[PDB]
Amino acid sequence: MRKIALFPGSFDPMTNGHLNLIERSAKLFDEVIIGVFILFTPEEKKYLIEEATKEMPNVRVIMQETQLTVESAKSLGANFLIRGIRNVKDYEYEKDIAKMNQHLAPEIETVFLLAEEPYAHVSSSLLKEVLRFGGDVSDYLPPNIYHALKQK
Amino acid sequence: MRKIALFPGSFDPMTNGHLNLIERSAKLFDEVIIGVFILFTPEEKKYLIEEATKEMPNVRVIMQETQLTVESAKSLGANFLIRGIRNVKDYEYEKDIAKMNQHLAPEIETVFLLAEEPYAHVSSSLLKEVLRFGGDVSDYLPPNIYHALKQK
Amino acid sequence: MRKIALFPGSFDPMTNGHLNLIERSAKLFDEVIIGVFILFTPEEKKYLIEEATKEMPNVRVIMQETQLTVESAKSLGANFLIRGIRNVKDYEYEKDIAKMNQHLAPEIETVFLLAEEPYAHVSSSLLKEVLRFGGDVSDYLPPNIYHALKQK
Amino acid sequence: MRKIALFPGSFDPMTNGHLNLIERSAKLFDEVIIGVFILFTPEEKKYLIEEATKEMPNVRVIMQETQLTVESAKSLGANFLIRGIRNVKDYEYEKDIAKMNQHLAPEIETVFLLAEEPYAHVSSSLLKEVLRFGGDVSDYLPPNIYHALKQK
Amino acid sequence: MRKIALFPGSFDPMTNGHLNLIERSAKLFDEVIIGVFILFTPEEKKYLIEEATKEMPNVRVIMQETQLTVESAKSLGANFLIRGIRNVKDYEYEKDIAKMNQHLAPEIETVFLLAEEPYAHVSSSLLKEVLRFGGDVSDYLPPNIYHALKQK
Amino acid sequence: MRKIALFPGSFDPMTNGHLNLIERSAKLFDEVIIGVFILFTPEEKKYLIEEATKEMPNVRVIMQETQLTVESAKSLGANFLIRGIRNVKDYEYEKDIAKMNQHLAPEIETVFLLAEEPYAHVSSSLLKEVLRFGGDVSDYLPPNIYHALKQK
């Protein structure tokens, strides 16, 4: 029986950090579902994220109208949530979310991987602020996502 | 003489973690005043909080117009501020508030209790997020506050 | 991959926390090896762990001469290491170990689980302090390791 | 590198903690440029900081329309950014900004000074809260800035 | 509960940070016991700490053989434990001790004060290093403990 | 004040982390002293570190016997101490040192640089623990130091 992980996010944008963690968890799980919780209509973000993840066969992308993460995993048979931790702040934020999800769905297990060094300082909020003032963050974004994003 | 503590807060909603701090507080001070700094009306929160804290003879609810916490404790003869710490983030935030409060009113002592480990992950903002999607957090709310909540 | 994990440790003593993390990880991996790195002889240590972990079919105990954890994982065919994080201190210390281990053996993934609430304050060092002053920490140790510790 | 530092921030208001970091900065660099990024008009803000820092011949003030800090530093010929760290939250936040700025302009160094401990708890967020309820925070503000805050 | 608190410690040396927390505690509790857990003589330590605290009438010093703190409290009739927190590492360490103590003796409450910022960086281990090298840390020690120290 | 900095350490071994901070500080100060506070004799250490830093005309290497860092600074004519911060543990530990040093020698300024992220997880204790089990941490040492080390 499959070990299935949901990797939830708003992926606004998907960064090479997300890709990195996705790549690594595809090795750890039978499958990984990227739940994009809904600049781009759902099926544009879906397009980009499938484009970006195309070379990984056990990885699928699903739009999810906003709801309880654990409800979305239950309805997909995902008994695992997979999250990254990049710093102390991230640790405590993720940890509160995991204790809450454990109360809500005790049979679902949150699993953590640490962010890799080139990406540990990268969050979409700082990315977006830098995108907004024109800075070159092209090293932090999958190329499809960078090219799609010039239409600003 | 009486040692009186003010326990300031929003209590939006009051949680079982708030209640646990109040119960532990009530063994430490002669009186605890729950100061509700102002969903519901003033009169409503007042009743609800009173209802939840009714088993505790030395605890009372005094609704407060938004002002400096120290000005409010001064006006009640509360020479102690009582607060909870549940994590490092909360630790550094309460810390800054205590030092500001000490510069404002050096005769007033801030006292801290650590959250009990069942509630150490509970924030009013996370609890509200779960409630809005219909998750069951009834075990983190006073029964009467859980009812008044469903009811609205 | 196929999914075998080494859970390294000194297990002096093994706690209910260790046990908890073993149980959760036996659900994620095909096999999990408990690597006890070296007042019991190792053989006594090995028997006690096995005895505590016996109801778990995909769990194996192995004694290891003190060596590089990654080399030990390589011998056993473990392509994962599994670790617990109980607090910020533990987070930064595991993180340095995981980054080093990944410099040494980049094909091995370190995967993390958060300590659950009852055991988040429990370390073997605090536990040994209590044990040495006669404190009752029997709720924190598996029953056979507690009875065994009494006879010693 | 030339010893020319940019000290960026919004200085609304400028505090004694800002002034202290500027004072210690002026002992370290040949030139320190205070970069004000934009109730107090910018023409006013410039004047107050100029006034507050008049005693330091190697310090000057420039208002910057908001842009990437590395680009403002480039334009002014600064090869150093100086920042202050007042707590763990402030450290992890500045570290991210620093690592991003190094990605954008790896030839600019970020240099850090710790807050002097009388101002380690002071942030404009907190200060402004206290001011607006009329608490006396006069000790945290250069007199010129304070005397000008009153006529609002 | 009766407002009787144990402030435990090795007090080697006792600092002005320790005095500061004792002064603050003596405003809250009917009785504050300084539990000195046992090179000055035990007899010497007792006199030294007694002379430092003499200005406070609801304080008393008791030497104690090393043992579980909650057993010492229970013997002396203390219902509260008073500790100080000076930083994040101190916070996580005291938190673990408090939870363990809560397990051993749930009727005893641990109460926390935050170090006054002048003493936030002062730890006996740091202090002892400086003393060993002859640095002047007279500001950080009750003058009587300092005079006594110059002797030995 | 004169741009003369002491970079204090035991440099056992000096790592590429250290070398990175000396290279960046060599851009900021007129003179950087590597202060080596005392496997290798002092003069062996001296020649290894001089050889590792020889391409910087404004760097020099001075052995010191263990003593208060700030009087070492004062003896050598340094006005600044330069340190690196790699993580939260390290930030709290350096902060206390810097605050004590400021007490002892208020005219000496401590200045911080953040660890560059390939070495952010590298410490003396962890490097030596790996070296003693045979691991290849050659990317982490100046090549001359690593060679000299493989001969002992």
From Swiss-Prot, chains A, B, C, D, E, F:
Cofactor: Mg(2+)
GO terms for cellular component: cytoplasm
Chief location bin: cytoplasm
Keywords: ATP-binding, Coenzyme A biosynthesis, Cytoplasm, Magnesium, Nucleotide-binding, Nucleotidyltransferase, Transferase
Site-annotated residues for Transition state stabilizer: H18
UniProt EC number: 2.7.7.3
GO annotation terms (biological process): coenzyme A biosynthetic process
InterPro entries: Cyt_trans-like, PPAT, Rossmann-like_a/b/a_fold
Name of the top EC class for this enzyme: transferase
GO terms for MF: ATP binding; pantetheine-phosphate adenylyltransferase activity
Residues reported to bind ATP: S10, H18, G84, I85, R86, E94, Y119, A120, H121, V122, S123, S124, S125
Segments crossing the lipid bilayer: none
Pfam families linked: CTP_transf_like
Binding site for substrate: S10, T69, R83
Subcellular location: Cytoplasm
Pathway: Cofactor biosynthesis; coenzyme A biosynthesis; CoA from (R)-pantothenate: step 4/5
Catalytic activities: (R)-4'-phosphopantetheine + ATP + H(+) = 3'-dephospho-CoA + diphosphate
Family membership: Belongs to the bacterial CoaD family.
PANTHER family: PHOSPHOPANTETHEINE ADENYLYLTRANSFERASE
Record text on subunit structure and interactions: Homohexamer.
Function: Reversibly transfers an adenylyl group from ATP to 4'-phosphopantetheine, yielding dephospho-CoA (dPCoA) and pyrophosphate.
The protein's name in its UniProt record: Phosphopantetheine adenylyltransferase
Taxonomic lineage from the root: Bacteria, Bacillati, Bacillota, Bacilli, Lactobacillales
